[PDB]
Amino acid sequence: VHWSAEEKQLITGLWGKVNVAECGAEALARLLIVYPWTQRFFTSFGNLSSASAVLGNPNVRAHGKKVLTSFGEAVKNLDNIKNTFAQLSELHCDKLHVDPENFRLLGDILIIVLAGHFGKDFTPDCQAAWQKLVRAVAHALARKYH
Amino acid sequence: VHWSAEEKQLITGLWGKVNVAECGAEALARLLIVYPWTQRFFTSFGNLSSASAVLGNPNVRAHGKKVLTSFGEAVKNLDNIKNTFAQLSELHCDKLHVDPENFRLLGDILIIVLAGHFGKDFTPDCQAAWQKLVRAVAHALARKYH
Amino acid sequence: VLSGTDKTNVKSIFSKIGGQADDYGAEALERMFVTYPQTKTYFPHFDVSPGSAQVKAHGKKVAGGLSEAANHIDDIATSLSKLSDLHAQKLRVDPVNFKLLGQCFLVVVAIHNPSALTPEAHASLDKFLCAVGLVLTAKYR
Amino acid sequence: VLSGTDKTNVKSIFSKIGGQADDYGAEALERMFVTYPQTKTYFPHFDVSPGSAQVKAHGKKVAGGLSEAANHIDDIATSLSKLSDLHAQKLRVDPVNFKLLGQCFLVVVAIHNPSALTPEAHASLDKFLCAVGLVLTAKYR
Ligand code: HEM
Ligand code: HEM
Ligand code: HEM
Numbered sequence: 001v002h003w004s005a006e007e008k009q010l011i012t013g014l015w016g017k018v019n020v021a022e023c024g025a026e027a028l029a030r031l032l033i034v035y036p037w038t039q040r041f042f043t044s045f046g047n048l049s050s051a052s053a054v055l056g057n058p059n060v061r062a063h064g065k066k067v068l069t070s071f072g073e074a075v076k077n078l079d080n081i082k083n084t085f086a087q088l089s090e091l092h093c094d095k096l097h098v099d100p101e102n103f104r105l106l107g108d109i110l111i112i113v114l115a116g117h118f119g120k121d122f123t124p125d126c127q128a129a130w131q132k133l134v135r136a137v138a139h140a141l142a143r144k145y146h
Numbered sequence: 147v148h149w150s151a152e153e154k155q156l157i158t159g160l161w162g163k164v165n166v167a168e169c170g171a172e173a174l175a176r177l178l179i180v181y182p183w184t185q186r187f188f189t190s191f192g193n194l195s196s197a198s199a200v201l202g203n204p205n206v207r208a209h210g211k212k213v214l215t216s217f218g219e220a221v222k223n224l225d226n227i228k229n230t231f232a233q234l235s236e237l238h239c240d241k242l243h244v245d246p247e248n249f250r251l252l253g254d255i256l257i258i259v260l261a262g263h264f265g266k267d268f269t270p271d272c273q274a275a276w277q278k279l280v281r282a283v284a285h286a287l288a289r290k291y292h
Numbered sequence: 293v294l295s296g297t298d299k300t301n302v303k304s305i306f307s308k309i310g311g312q313a314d315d316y317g318a319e320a321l322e323r324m325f326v327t328y329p330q331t332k333t334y335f336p337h338f339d340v341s342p343g344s345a346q347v348k349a350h351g352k353k354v355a356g357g358l359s360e361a362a363n364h365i366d367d368i369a370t371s372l373s374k375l376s377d378l379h380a381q382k383l384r385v386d387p388v389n390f391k392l393l394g395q396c397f398l399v400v401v402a403i404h405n406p407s408a409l410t411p412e413a414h415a416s417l418d419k420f421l422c423a424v425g426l427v428l429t430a431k432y433r
Numbered sequence: 434v435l436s437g438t439d440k441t442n443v444k445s446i447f448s449k450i451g452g453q454a455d456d457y458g459a460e461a462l463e464r465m466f467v468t469y470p471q472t473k474t475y476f477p478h479f480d481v482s483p484g485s486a487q488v489k490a491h492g493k494k495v496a497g498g499l500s501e502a503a504n505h506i507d508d509i510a511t512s513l514s515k516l517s518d519l520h521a522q523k524l525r526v527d528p529v530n531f532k533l534l535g536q537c538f539l540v541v542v543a544i545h546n547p548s549a550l551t552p553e554a555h556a557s558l559d560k561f562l563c564a565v566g567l568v569l570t571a572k573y574r
């Protein structure tokens with residue numbers, strides 16, 4: 001992807017204020033609850049199966065935070081988005097066999113998270129930059145599907 | 147994508163026997179009929195709207211043949227699949243605004259075409275190589291979506 | 293196909309976002325046109341610039357259908373039956389497009405009402421929105 | 434939601450591919466496992482090598498459901514009601530996966546019967562197949 005000067009501002013200025021532990025856990029919990037088939041990938045986490053089970057699981061909070069930090073690395077590198085997710089691509093594709101379409105589902109849900117959390121400061125322009133990024137990252141995990 | 151020696155054989159050996167004018171017209175007619183929303187992109191072609199209208203349209207035959215020849219260029223270049231669809235990507239993305247998901251719909255329909263036409267010689271291995279290609283090309287028109 | 297628990301849950305959020313429907317309808321399309329520029333192919337007769345009163349006038353009727361479909365959540369397909377021709381028969385809308393608007397629609401409720409959109413509501417609303425997008429794309433199947 | 438014209442069109446192809454259902458069921462999964470290796474995640478208890486009799490034994494019941502759903506094309510959801518738990522509730526199958534099998538299923542009918550699969554049949558069959566994949570993924574909505 002090619003990024004504008006004014007695009008990096010909206011993205012970087014907003015990352016600056018995000019609580020990764022809070023959102024990390026929102027993002028992941030919502031995914032598990034809105035798309036219940038994503039559940040089978042996380043069986044090692046003990047009980048899922050009910051909204052409240054999902055919410056009160058310590059793994060969901062810890063994993064969630066890791067996922068978001070990952071998006072961190074994208075904010076940082078903006079030009080180098082491949083190469084930075086290469087090893088992570090092998091893992092999601094080669095070992096786990098997560099169909100790429102779920103990477104989109106996690107991107108969209110992330111925008112709802114940042115949307116609810118930032119209120120009016122999630123302007124339309126900003127939401128457009130954020131989509132461009134969430135799509136760039138999702139594309140950069142697809143990679144190992146050749 | 148990375149291609150094996152034995153993979154190029156199945157692909158190249160099979161291209162060798164394909165009637166582009168016949169299939170070209172099958173591929174495109176089926177697309178227009180099975181996914182009737184693809185119709186709006188082709189309004190310059192005069193009447194679509196009914197299976198038989200679609201079938202007896204001279205544009206559908208002529209356009210269809212052009213589409214397939216295009217896949218030709220992929221058979222030829224196997225390693226260089228981007229760069230070869232770059233100008234074509236700009237056209238589908240920038241000018242027309244065809245959502246990429248329809249490029250998948252055209253790939254799948256193409257496999258049914260080659261399937262019906264070749265019978266038993268469309269072995270499972272071969273159908274796997276053909277999918278790897280139809281997906282590589284579809285990916286190589288996505289390109290201009292950044 | 294919409295359980296009793298999703299229903300008394302979608303009836304609930306629409307009586308809380310009731311008298312704001314309309315404004316969320318304006319902002320929804322506006323976000324769509326900015327974040328998904330392709331969607332403007334369909335509205336060439338409109339003024340699409342940030343601010344337009346056509347866009348305001350249009351969003352007031354998109355909310356309309358939504359509010360309505362919620363009033364008749366047991367029979368959503370008779371409720372919306374004239375709208376399914378417009379979108380599928382006449383205007384021939386790519387189905388991927390119903391996801392995009394709905395997605396934009398959730399962004400707006402989360403902006404103005406962070407606490408109506410709990411994880412669970414998010415679930416009920418998300419299946420209600422693309423049971424609405426299935427009635428509007430029905431004649432393709 | 435399945436017109437009278439699609440129906441007397443899907444009832445038609447299934448009485449022509451009738452006594453071959455079973456063999457097309459074996460070959461369908463086999464092609465799926467080769468062209469979409471990911472689908473093997475779900476069947477780890479099986480021998481999946483080209484030729485297996487588990488794979489033959491399994492394909493005979495996947496045809497089963499199909500043939501059946503066609504016998505009761507007015508009520509496909511009562512016809513297949515126990516199968517919707519297995520796939521959605523217990524085994525938790527990615528929905529993208531129903532497209533892949535159906536796609537493989539068309540490849541096989543086109544191989545063995547190039548002339549049943551006219552453009553139009555291809556249309557009726559294609560909406561019948563992913564009205565079947567909607568009954569089996571129903572509890573996610
Ligand atoms: C789209 C953005 C995503 C990012 C940035 C991301 C990132 C990560 C990270 C940082 C880890 C942990 C690193 C490690 O332990 O080596 C991980 C592991 C994992 N991810 Fe993802 N992920 C994403 C999407 C998904 C999706 C959609 C799924 C499927 C529902 C998924 C399933 C998993 C699983 C099952 C693990 C391993 C869990 C374990 O070892 O217990 N991820 N991912
Ligand atoms: C996925 C493989 C595809 C290939 C290889 C392909 C290739 C081509 C070629 C060779 C042309 C004509 C070249 C020219 O006149 O400059 C063309 C034009 C066009 N294509 Fe595609 N195409 C593909 C998919 C699609 C899809 C899915 C759609 C949308 C339903 C589409 C819509 C169009 C349209 C509307 C034109 C211009 C027609 C005109 O000028 O009258 N194509 N494409
Ligand atoms: C999400 C659910 C949607 C609802 C409830 C909805 C509702 C409506 C309504 C109420 C009308 C005008 C009806 C009248 O006065 O006769 C309309 C027209 C229209 N819709 Fe939708 N719509 C939806 C999604 C979409 C999407 C996703 C698109 C494509 C981007 C689209 C494209 C159009 C166009 C081009 C018109 C006609 C413009 C005009 O009448 O001036 N709609 N829609």
Ligand code: HEM
Nearest residue numbers: 472475476494495497498499519520524526530531534535
């Ligand atoms: C396309 C329509 C499908 C039909 C009609 C179908 C049918 C069936 C039937 C009849 C059974 C065994 C029922 C019994 O004896 O109780 C079964 C089990 C199963 N299905 Fe499906 N299936 C379909 C699609 C899929 C797909 C796409 C997947 C995922 C790749 C899948 C995964 C499984 C698994 C893992 C089992 C259990 C294995 C076993 O019982 O030994 N199914 N299915």
